[PDB]
Paper text:
The spike (S) protein is the major surface antigen of SARS-CoV-2. The S protein uses its receptor-binding domain (RBD) to engage the host receptor angiotensin I converting enzyme 2 (ACE2) for viral entry. RBD-targeting antibodies could then neutralize SARS-CoV-2 by blocking ACE2 binding. To understand the molecular features that endow IGHV3-53 with favorable properties for RBD recognition, we determined the crystal structures of two IGHV3-53–neutralizing antibodies, CC12.1 and CC12.3, in complex with the SARS-CoV-2 RBD and with the cross-reactive Fab CR3022 to SARS-like CoVs.
We determined four complex crystal structures, CC12.1/RBD, CC12.3/RBD, CC12.1/RBD/CR3022, and CC12.3/RBD/CR3022, at resolutions of 3.20, 2.33, 2.70, and 2.90 Å, respectively. CC12.1 and CC12.3 were previously isolated from a SARS-CoV-2–infected patient and were shown to be specific for the RBD. Although CC12.1 and CC12.3 are both encoded by IGHV3-53, CC12.1 uses IGHJ6, IGKV1-9, and IGKJ3, whereas CC12.3 uses IGHJ4, IGKV3-20, and IGKJ1. Among 17 ACE2-binding residues on RBD, 15 and 16 are within the epitopes of CC12.1 and B38, respectively, and 11 are in the epitope of CC12.3. Although both CC12.1 and B38 use IGKV1-9, CC12.3 uses IGKV3-20, which suggests that IGHV3-53 can pair with different light chains to target the ACE2-binding site of the SARS-CoV-2 RBD. For example, whereas CDR H3 of CC12.1 interacts with RBD Y453 through a hydrogen bond, CDR H3 of CC12.3 and B38 do not form such a bond. Although the CDR H3 sequences of CC12.1 and CC12.3 differ, both are nine amino acids in length (Kabat numbering). Longer CDR H3s cannot be accommodated in these IGHV3-53 antibodies because their epitopes are relatively flat, with only a small pocket to insert their CDR H3 loop.
Author numbering:
A (entry chain H): 1 to 52, 52A, 53 to 82, 82A, 82B, 82C, 83 to 100, 100A, ...
B (entry chain C): 1 to 82, 82A, 82B, 82C, 83 to 100, 100A, 101 to 216
C (entry chain L): 1 to 27, 27A, 27B, 27C, 27D, 27E, 27F, 28 to 215
D (entry chain D): 1 to 213
E (entry chain A): 334 to 445, 448 to 528
Write the structure that this text describes.
Amino acid sequence: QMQLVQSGTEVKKPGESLKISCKGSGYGFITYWIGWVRQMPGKGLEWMGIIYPGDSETRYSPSFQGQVTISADKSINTAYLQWSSLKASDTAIYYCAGGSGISTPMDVWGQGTTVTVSSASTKGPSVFPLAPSSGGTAALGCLVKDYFPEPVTVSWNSGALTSGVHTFPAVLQSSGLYSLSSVVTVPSSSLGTQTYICNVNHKPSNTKVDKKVEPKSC
Amino acid sequence: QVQLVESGGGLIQPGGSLRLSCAASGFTVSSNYMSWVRQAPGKGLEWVSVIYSGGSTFYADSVKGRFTISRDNSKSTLYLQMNSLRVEDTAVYYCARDFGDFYFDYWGQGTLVTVSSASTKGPSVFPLAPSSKSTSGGTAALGCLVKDYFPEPVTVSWNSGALTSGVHTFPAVLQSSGLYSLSSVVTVPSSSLGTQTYICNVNHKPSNTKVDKKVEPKSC
Amino acid sequence: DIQLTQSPDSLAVSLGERATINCKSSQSVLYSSINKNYLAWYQQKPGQPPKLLIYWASTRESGVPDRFSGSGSGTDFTLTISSLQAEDVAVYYCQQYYSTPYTFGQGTKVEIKRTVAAPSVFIFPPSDEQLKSGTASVVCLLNNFYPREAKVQWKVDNALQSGNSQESVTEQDSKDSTYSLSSTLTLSKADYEKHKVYACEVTHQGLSSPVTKSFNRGECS
Amino acid sequence: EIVLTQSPGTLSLSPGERATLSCRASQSVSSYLAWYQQKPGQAPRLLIYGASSRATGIPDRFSGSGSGTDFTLTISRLEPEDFAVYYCQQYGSSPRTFGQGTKLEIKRTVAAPSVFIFPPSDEQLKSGTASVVCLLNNFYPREAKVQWKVDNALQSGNSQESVTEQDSKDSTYSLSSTLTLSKADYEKHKVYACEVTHQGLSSPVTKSFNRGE
Amino acid sequence: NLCPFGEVFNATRFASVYAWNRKRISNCVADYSVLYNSASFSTFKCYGVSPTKLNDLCFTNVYADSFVIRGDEVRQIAPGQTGKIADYNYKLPDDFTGCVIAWNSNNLDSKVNYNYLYRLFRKSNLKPFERDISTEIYQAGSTPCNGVEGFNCYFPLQSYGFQPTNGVGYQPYRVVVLSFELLHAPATVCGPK
Ligand SMILES: *[C@@H]1O[C@H](CO)[C@@H](O[C@@H]2O[C@H](CO)[C@@H](O[C@@H]3O[C@H](CO)[C@@H](O)[C@H](O)[C@@H]3O)[C@H](O)[C@H]2NC(C)=O)[C@H](O)[C@H]1NC(C)=O
């Protein structure tokens, strides 16, 4: 059995070109047709097209013909999917999949390549404390606002506190920036004695921010 | 005795359509590979399309999607339908018997296709009158100037085909005007000046113009 | 060419009970040469790529547990999960590979149906560190509820807000089968200072009446 | 797309000598190559196929050689209509492609042109345009110099030349140079002269006429 | 009772595509693991079924066709193709299910210089899985040939010029087409399970 491994995350401005790759490794690859599947955020899968690397026979879906180009380098067992001019609507995750013939299901799947297309530029997040105000079990949290691109990571007490933690999915605000929240529930008994710190890491902007969340003075 | 005769060529606007036909004899069209090959003015040969003995058809990338080759066994004729024509298609098109998609052992005479937006214009024909200087015991020259016509071609002969040797009809030249001009001259003994009468016959069929022009020695 | 319609779009099953998903084809996909339907069923868990469950509409890919079954033929097929387990929460797709272009179903989301659990509501005013920034964000959190449908409305001096709030939901928790949600109201420092009462009103199946959590700007809440 | 380059662009040889054309290929077609001869105004004629085989009716003086990427065509004893353009064509891989041709010209003895000049018709004069024509007939070699002189002033930029292809039993060339201008500017001048320089003449040859005589 | 794929794939000499070879596989247990797990093939194109899931399914009969063509033409051994080979030598149906396996054999079928033939001329296309081994002089004109080559009378077959220094497209490729029949009769060809 064989495995497909795709290229890494892409973040591009509208109008630039992009070529993502998908390399197969293992036994039986000579028999494999490699298709491409699009999944836009929160929606379902769309079959884009398929190629046979041995002779680069390509079949596109009518909704994608002329929009993208599906190619292959057979000497390195790699398929390629590329746009010459990206639009913001191309923001999605692209999976490469493999079936051991045409008109056969896709047995093998890549891990996916996340492509963001946005006019926004790299900006690190601002971390604000959602201080505990509460009812019997004392929820608190952190507000990680106005960053681009995805993703950020949020840990509590440098990774020690995980029980009761909810780090919400980021939402895309109309400014083109992302904003996220992470909350945790702890015994109100412990609010005066134990200290709680949230650690936000945004590697695209190389930003590490540790912020303390404590009952507000007022 | 193989014969191949093309027809259907002429002037056509860009984006328009034409249908070239090739009447064939001496072999069975239904059982032979046949091909259209084109030659731009004064340039090389370009294979355009092929129909196989079994019916399969193939096209050059430059015309794929716009051209369609076909055949009729009942009429023993080969057709090339040309759609969405571009100026780059302007050429003489040759019908050719094809030896198994390898080489073209018999060719037709060709038919000329001019893709353009310019309008057809018939020529004006003027005399190039012979010398009064001549040499009265030597050789003189006279001729016809066929100016300001479009598109190609024009046919010129002398005394309704009776006069052929010593005849030089020069290739046409594209003027600044976008129109073509041409001249055709004849060499004669000098004192045939007043024994014979020379008139040139000029036919430009894209215009349906035909003119028979007398060229006499000038009045002194 | 060929189109697939799944039904339903969402499905809530108890642990150990049976889940059924239907897929209707625009056009019969059965080569009667081989007498096989060219229909496949895929499973996709949150964050993970699709995984092939069933092919030829009933034959199970290797490694897939025997609780997944494929049935039907012609234009109508069904995927069945015998005794739904927690690790089966996912979106399930049908796909035809009878001819190119391949086409997918729209997808059917399958979650655990547990007993109704009311949310716990909390409200957080904007930090003064953010009030120095020029904007103000009020956060209202609904924790550990089921089902997922919940109504969260913001009221600024009892004026209903629109267009200035965004909310987010977690994936269904693997242990207790519950959801959490956070709604964020964002408005300028200027607009924030022009009002006193900020309220978050929540309506859910597990609550007998809507619950309101509010605070007055400035006063210690 | 297999590109075929023929060498050289032109060749000028005498009757009796033997000519060798070359064709080289972007990839190797292995023998799948043919040679065609095309005379002016006529269609191509099949000369050789399989890189070695003469077509029917082709005399033995034509011979084909080579394979791989390099092929040669040889004519053994050149005769007065062997003079045309010659194309190589591959049929190893699709699409079939030709070379861009090499033109074969004659080399006969030098012959001086006979020069004539024609004033414009008056029919064309009333038309508002004047065309004066100079004719250089039946010379070799092709290269000649035609110089228009109007009132002894060298004219440039309003004349056009036209050359015939080799008449193929005298092997000659002939050339026409026509000067076009207004009737206003035509009547602005008196003497119109054509001066011809060529290999076959000791000195330039001039033919003239005055306007209105 | 193992199915004899080896005497087809590993045959020392292959057939010419105009007279392509066909082996009828029946009443045996077939191991396709030796096929799809090998690294000897340039192309392995399967239609309607995948070779990895035949190890658990059964057919009435299997047919293994074999022949040598040039690489340029391996494109044509596929449903919905046209060209000299697909039209006059070997034709696969549009509803074909099965595999087309092909590999380079320049070291075995090229010397210094050939032996393989293909049909150049045929008045009509072949039906799927038709084999025409005629050598009748092809009559391209109205006048009958009476068995002598000449004008309008061509020999229908032509030899490949297989030579080891050609480009890879011009080099010989050995091709094996596996087709699977499943009429409603006893199924005799089976995977190991
Ligand atoms: C046609 O002949 C070739 C020989 O050129 C056959 O290939 C050999 O087939 C055997 C299968 O019995 C392969 O064996 C396996 O080897 C691996 C190590 O690579 C080992 O781990 C396995 O347990 C097994 O023993 C062998 O590798 C293979 N050799 C080559 C060079 O491919 C081929 O099977 C014949 N074809 C048919 C259809 O029988």
